[PDB]
Amino acid sequence: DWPVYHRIDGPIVMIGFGSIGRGTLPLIERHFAFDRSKLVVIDPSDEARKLAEARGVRFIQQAVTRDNYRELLVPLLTAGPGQGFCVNLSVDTSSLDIMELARENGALYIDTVVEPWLGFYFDPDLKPEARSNYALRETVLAARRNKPGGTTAVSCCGANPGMVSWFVKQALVNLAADLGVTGEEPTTREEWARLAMDLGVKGIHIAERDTQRASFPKPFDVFVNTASVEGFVSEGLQPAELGWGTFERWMPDNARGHDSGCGAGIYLLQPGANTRVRSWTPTAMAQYGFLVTHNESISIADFLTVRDAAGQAVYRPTCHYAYHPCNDAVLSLHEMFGSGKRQSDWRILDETEIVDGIDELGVLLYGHGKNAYWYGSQLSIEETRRIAPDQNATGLQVSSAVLAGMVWALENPNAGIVEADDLDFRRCLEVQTPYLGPVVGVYTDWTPLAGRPGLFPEDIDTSDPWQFRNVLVRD
Amino acid sequence: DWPVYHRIDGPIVMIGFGSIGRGTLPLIERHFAFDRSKLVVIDPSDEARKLAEARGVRFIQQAVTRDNYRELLVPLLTAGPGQGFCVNLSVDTSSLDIMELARENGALYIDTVVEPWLGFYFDPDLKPEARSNYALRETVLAARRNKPGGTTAVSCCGANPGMVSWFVKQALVNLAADLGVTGEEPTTREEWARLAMDLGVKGIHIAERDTQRASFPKPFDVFVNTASVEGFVSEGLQPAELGWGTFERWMPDNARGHDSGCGAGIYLLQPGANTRVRSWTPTAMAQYGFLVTHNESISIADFLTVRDAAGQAVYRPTCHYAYHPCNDAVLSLHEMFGSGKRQSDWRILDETEIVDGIDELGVLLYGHGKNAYWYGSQLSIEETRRIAPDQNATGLQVSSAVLAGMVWALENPNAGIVEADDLDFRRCLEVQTPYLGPVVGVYTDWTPLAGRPGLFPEDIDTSDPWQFRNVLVRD
Ligand SMILES: NC(=O)c1ccc[n+]([C@@H]2O[C@H](COP(=O)([O-])OP(=O)(O)OC[C@H]3O[C@@H](n4cnc5c(N)ncnc54)[C@H](O)[C@@H]3O)[C@@H](O)[C@H]2O)c1
Ligand SMILES: NC(=O)c1ccc[n+]([C@@H]2O[C@H](COP(=O)([O-])OP(=O)(O)OC[C@H]3O[C@@H](n4cnc5c(N)ncnc54)[C@H](O)[C@@H]3O)[C@@H](O)[C@H]2O)c1
């Protein structure tokens, strides 16, 4: 049987019922005990309403907005009898404002992104620095400094950000064993950072290759993806963004830093989904990824920062996304950027439309004595259908991470505002691994200088293959 | 009944029986009178041999090389009783050497590319300039200067290079007529160049969008295309190249000119099939094209050059390819450049494998009073199957162009070495148009500055939207 981890006696408030909400609700019903009538789904769309009604779940057809979120959500979060859980899987809503509302009213909180209120992403009066995920994350860090401790709110606990933070810790443990580095397993952030430094990890790619393909050819003027099209396009049009490692000797002319905050990131004055980087995964081998901004690019680099007494950073890894989405999404990007505007329509691939493929999602640690190491999941669509309904492999890696975060929050309900890097990674992977298919570690001798230089002059750094100067693709 | 244009009174030697040879053979058999035993195909491929046997045509399974071409081709082309025709549709053979051999022996000649002997494209001892199509074309121009007149040899007479030269002439005439400019169309090179100057044509894109889709999804580690994969990859890895207009006021730091030759071209120190440009076609609307090197980028800009009394160029249009290949080819390029090497296998889509689509191929004249004008063919796979066997829409545009050039060569057999810009464009389009489906001219308001600047700073020239500065896709 499937484990029922805990009883939830309070209200379960799910904000948003898109691809991730539809895959997460069945997991919540499977793994927690509660009266089904205590669950409530809020979503503005008719499509979501019909799906919730088909499940006999209470539904409120409203867009949560800055104007209504307090009057709308407080009664739902405080309905009792016990502590409620707010499961935020929406677009167009402020993660920070909803999280602070939940904590104000004693309700647990989890989300998979630091989302702003509608309008932020395309606000023409915002400076590029202000549109960065670094800046949005800094609003969460400030909230934590302002109100330490208290009710647990889990920020950015999906597949990536989320799970990959746990993969980094496991990968560091495996690397220490394989490199003969002795010592006890870290138990504090400082100890984790020092292990990464001692192992010589120069940087980390969130190295992903989605090979799911549809039973129909990509339609003209339709954006196709395996998860949120609105969310992927939004993050893809934000600046390319990365955690910036101490080993880097070069940044492009259009790179910029931040005057304040944790200090772990840079951004480029170009859209991340039109920025290519050289990377590698077990199934793809050498591939292009897109340098799409992601919270974990900053959070992981920040988490693994070592500082001296004066507080200056002496070690920090480079960390960023290196995303090869499904073929139809690759075509959708070429179409969107080539036309200069979003397609007229979009669709997310349903499991019934996917004929084969996997979502290979892992972390690539590089620069150490064994060059590069990839650790992560190779979950296939066939396995997904076997073990979880209403979602594809992309969705299941996300929904199962939300499940793990919820289990952790119930067992640690007064931990304050926390990121995935703050959770107990072993417990979270213990809950999530049944839904991840093959989880494997693979070494490779590939480097970004493989085969280079070619028949054209290239601006490369031959002294250190893994420099960003060698990873970034110029156009 | 199909028209029979001419009797060929000698041997027909077709070098190469790939996608284009297979599409051109039925048109030769359809439109020319000759004894069946006069035609012979030469190709080293076993796949090619079996198809030729099924077609009942003489086949010699041999690679033409520097070492054997004289011993092989001279007897075959001079078998008599009269003038033969060398129809060169191969890869890895020297167009120049074979052309000069055919001419030395009184045989007509046609090809669709200035191909070099095997080894040239990837010779590591060659500078990028020496690997350019500008340089290859200059060998043909020098051969013409050294031996003017003589037997007709048609260089680069496919769809593009080839047919698009005739489209440029027709487009110019249409542009003038659409402005109410009546009277004598030009008859000399200098008059054509002045028509383009007088109408204010700043530049020309060879603006192509292939929408042919396969009945099977893109296989991993397989390069898929609708015509020669080897030929497309070769030119895709040559330097980006363009005819360079007098109106341009900016070029990239890695752009280079030529010390010698006609003077009409620049090249970039980067591969063309990984260089993107902003362009437009009627069915695609705004799209990315790849800036792949092509003979006609130089020959058209050269043809349309106006010089002053001293001999200095005072007007010349920009001209280059803006190629959006079929979706599987787009994915194949992303795969190839992302891995840094050619896929292990490749395949060309057969008409039986194509579910739908067109090859939209035309010329986009811009900078004139009506901004932009696209003229060309919208041939669909469905129409192709009705009018010509053994090829897709891509192949038929090419094979019908070779048919037209062969007709022109037979009708003008003492014209010496000629390019597509040298032929009677009306007669050539008269022969080819039955195979081009819809041939239309479409005006558009679109410019490369549409929607720009976006939310990031960009280096653009707002006073002149069609400047290469605005067309080239840069970081
Ligand atoms: N961390 C990760 O790994 C990860 C992965 C995928 C998605 N995500 C994020 O999770 C979120 C959900 O993804 P998805 O795929 O389900 O998206 P989706 O687009 O499928 O669904 C979004 C849903 O939000 C609803 N919505 C829109 N405006 C709203 C409002 N004002 N209030 C409430 N609901 C509103 C829509 O009606 C829609 O059903 C997105 O923000 C996405 O960026 C994270
Ligand atoms: N101008 C245009 O519009 C245009 C369009 C398409 C192709 N082309 C060119 O036409 C040519 C043919 O294209 P394709 O699609 O048929 O290519 P293809 O790859 O299908 O076929 C090429 C053929 O050449 C043969 N070959 C290889 N080496 C040879 C040798 N030494 N001697 C004789 N034959 C040899 C191969 O066996 C093969 O059958 C290529 O050079 C291509 O670049 C021009």
Author numbering:
A (entry chain A), B (entry chain B): 3 to 477
What does the paper say about this structure?
Bacterial HSS is mostly found in α-proteobacteria and in some β- and γ-proteobacteria, including pathogenic strains such as Legionella pneumophila, Brucella spp. and various P. aeruginosa strains, including PA7 and PA14. It catalyzes the conversion of two molecules of putrescine (PUT; 1,4-diaminobutane) into one molecule of sym-homospermidine [HSP; bis(4-aminobutyl)amine] as the main reaction along with several side reactions. Bacterial HSS is NAD+-dependent, active at neutral to basic pH with an optimum at pH ∼8.8, and shows increased activity in the presence of 50 mM potassium ion. The cofactor NAD+ is bound as a prosthetic group in the binding pocket with its nicotinamide ring being part of the active site.
More evidence for cation–π interaction as a requirement for efficient catalysis might be inferred from the inactive variant W229A. The ‘outer’ amino group in the W229A variant, however, is shifted towards or attracted by the carboxyl group of Glu237 (distance 3.3 Å) compared with the wild-type protein (distance 4.4 Å). In context of the oxidation of PUT C4 by NAD+ as part of the proposed reaction mechanism, the distance between PUT C4 and NAD+ C4N is 4.4 Å in the variant and 2.2 Å in the wild-type structure. An explanation for the inactivity of the W229A variant could therefore be the missing cation–π interaction, which prevents appropriate stabilization of the ‘outer’ amino group of PUT at the ‘center amino site’ near the nicotinamide ring. This could ultimately impede hydride transfer between PUT C4 and the nicotinamide ring as a prerequisite for imine formation. However, the lack of a bulky, confining side chain at position 229 broadens the active site and might thereby allow increased flexibility of the PUT molecule.
